[PDB]
Ligand binder design. Sequence first.
Ligand SMILES: [Zn+2]
Ligand SMILES: [Zn+2]
Ligand SMILES: [Zn+2]
Length: 92
Amino acid sequence: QKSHKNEKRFKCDQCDYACRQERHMIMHKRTHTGEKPYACSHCDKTFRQKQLLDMHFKRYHDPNFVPAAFVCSKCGKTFTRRNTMARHADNC
DNA sequence: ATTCTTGTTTTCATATCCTAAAATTAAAGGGAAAATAAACAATACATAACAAAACATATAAAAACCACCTCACTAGCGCCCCCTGCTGGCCTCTGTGGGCACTGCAA
Ligand SMILES: [Zn+2]
Ligand SMILES: [Zn+2]
Ligand SMILES: [Zn+2]
């Protein structure tokens, strides 16, 4: 098992992607064989993956969405994604 | 005158006594061979005395037998680690389970 320890332990039958964890195999499988049994309580949307889209539910319906400012350096403009702040800060 | 009894001496007679010669017979004397007895001497048997041998008692002299002591062996039970292996938690290092943020792709 030291061969399999901290490696791509679980192969996928349909495609050659591999993940270390089983949970990843169940989520990966649902994309190939569409089950999407997770459903926002306020809209029609049916989600494949777990509570990240339950976070969809939360935010799409909660007026307390509160987008984290995440202010940069001197210019100070706000962006919703970390990679954007790092790239624009490198030359700001 | 004649006849008849009775008493007393005489004398034969017949048994007895005495006497002496024979014969004889038993005593008695002597010669001699047995012969019992007796005096003395020798042998054998029995009794008594002396000396020695045999028997019985005491004593002690090795000596044998029995009982006690003692110096070991034989059992005995702890005693004390000691070593070795399993066992039952214990804990921490990998490793089993999972939530979730993150990204690359292609709309
Ligand atoms: Zn697959
Ligand atoms: Zn919703
Ligand atoms: Zn800036």
